[PDB]
Amino acid sequence: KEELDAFHQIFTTTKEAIERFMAMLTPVIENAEDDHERLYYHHIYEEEEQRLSRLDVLIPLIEKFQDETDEGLFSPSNNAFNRLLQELNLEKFGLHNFIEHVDLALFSFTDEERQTLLKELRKDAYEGYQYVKEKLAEINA
Amino acid sequence: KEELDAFHQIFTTTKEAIERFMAMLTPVIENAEDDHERLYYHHIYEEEEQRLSRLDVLIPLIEKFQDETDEGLFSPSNNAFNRLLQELNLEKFGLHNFIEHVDLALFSFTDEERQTLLKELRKDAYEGYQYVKEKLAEINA
Ligand SMILES: [Fe+3]
Ligand SMILES: [Fe+3]
């Protein structure tokens, strides 16, 4: 399945993107002016941390499926297929929420360096989201 | 299991709380001044909408377990037990994120009426979170 390879690449990319976005958020949280601003950026940080923990479950499960798509003879268990569809659907919403976190940060981090990095993260996530959305829809066969 | 009844009550309460918090957010989003503010409140709305969709899966699964805890003779399937622990753990983080959304709104909605409602939602979620956290920890038996 080329789809499983694409999913593997999309969610590996997004894991690295989370790490780069957390590194960006870290000084902002440590230097926050006042309780509201501190909670806001720490909250987004936590949501992405949670998403990273889930990706470390999803990516290995993609990998089990990939391991069998060269023999290409056995259909996945319907239990396994459903666990993978559930995890992919949840992480589709995670990608969308990440795009919006990046969009929110783009409003607040106006220097050229962070603008450039955030726009790059956003472009990758957008591409990955649109692929995941389309292929999950196509999976009502 | 008194625990399953408590979980049922905590997640039913939080579903109704999401609905009341979304009703609060709705006019704020429709009247938002400018793109940043609109995205911010619409983003929180979406995250709670996503959480509501998951609660409509979790609560029925609690209910299947409850249905058997009066005969109290059959242990759950280990597959069912694990699906319920996974969903409960995810919704523990959802409760925590909801507490933080309410905390963020408490900074911005300063009138007495919305302050009072938000503090009530926050208290219930806090109590429910602390119970879910403690009981999931205790579930390494
Ligand atoms: Fe968020
Ligand atoms: Fe949030």
Residue numbers in the entry:
A (entry chain A), B (entry chain A): 2 to 142
Copy out sentences from the published article reporting this entry, exactly as the authors wrote them:
Phylogenetic analysis revealed that the IMEF cargo protein is a member of the Flp superfamily and is most closely related to Dps proteins but no known ferroxidase motifs could be detected based on the primary sequence alone. We determined the x-ray crystal structure of the IMEF cargo to a final resolution of 1.72 Å. The cargo adopts a four-helix bundle fold characteristic of other members of the Flp superfamily and forms a dimer with two Fe atoms bound at the subunit interface creating a ferroxidase site based on an alternative ferroxidase sequence motif. Through structure and sequence analysis, we identified a set of conserved residues involved in the formation of the dinuclear ferroxidase center. This IMEF ferroxidase motif differs from known examples and represents an alternative way of forming an inter-subunit ferroxidase center. Due to flexibility, the C-terminal linker and TP are not resolved in the cargo x-ray structure in accordance with observations from our cryo-EM analysis. Removal of the 13 C-terminal residues results in empty encapsulin shells confirming that the IMEF TP is necessary for cargo encapsulation. For the IMEF cargo alone, a sigmoidal ferroxidase iron oxidation curve was observed indicative of autocatalytic Fe oxidation taking place at newly formed mineral surfaces. However, assaying the IMEF cargo-loaded encapsulin results in a typical hyperbolic enzyme catalysis curve. Therefore, the IMEF cargo protein is able to enzymatically oxidize the majority of ferrous iron before uncontrolled autocatalytic mineralization can lead to bulk precipitation of iron which would likely destroy the iron storage function of the IMEF-system.
